[PDB]
């Protein structure tokens, strides 16, 4: 049913981002701050987030 | 590669994985997903992901 199907979509999310976010530090050599997610909404309803990353580095 | 060039590759991947969740989710259901809210989960290494809480509308 349809509060389980939620969780285990917001599960997985949160395991992809997770793991976008390591390979991203990874394949850098820097650290992903923060995460910008701007909703994709259109006309049927939300579509998706659009997603910008921030990453730091020493200066 | 580039940072730049990682970096874009990494948002659109994500984007995608959402939009087809979302899709996939609302198909589930019938219904139709309002709202996602993230929320940083830290921990004392960094920033490890976003935790993530769906929001989804009913009819009265």
């Not at 976010?21 to 259109?42: H, P, Q």
């Amino acid at each position: 049913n349809i509060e389980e199907l939620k969780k285990q979509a917001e599960t997985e999310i949160a395991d992809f981002i997770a793991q976008k976010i390591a390979e991203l530090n990874k394949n850098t050599g820097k650290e992903v701050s923060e995460i910008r997610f701007t909703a994709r909404e259109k006309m049927t309803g939300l579509e998706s987030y659009d997603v910008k990353i921030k990453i730091m580095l020493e200066h």
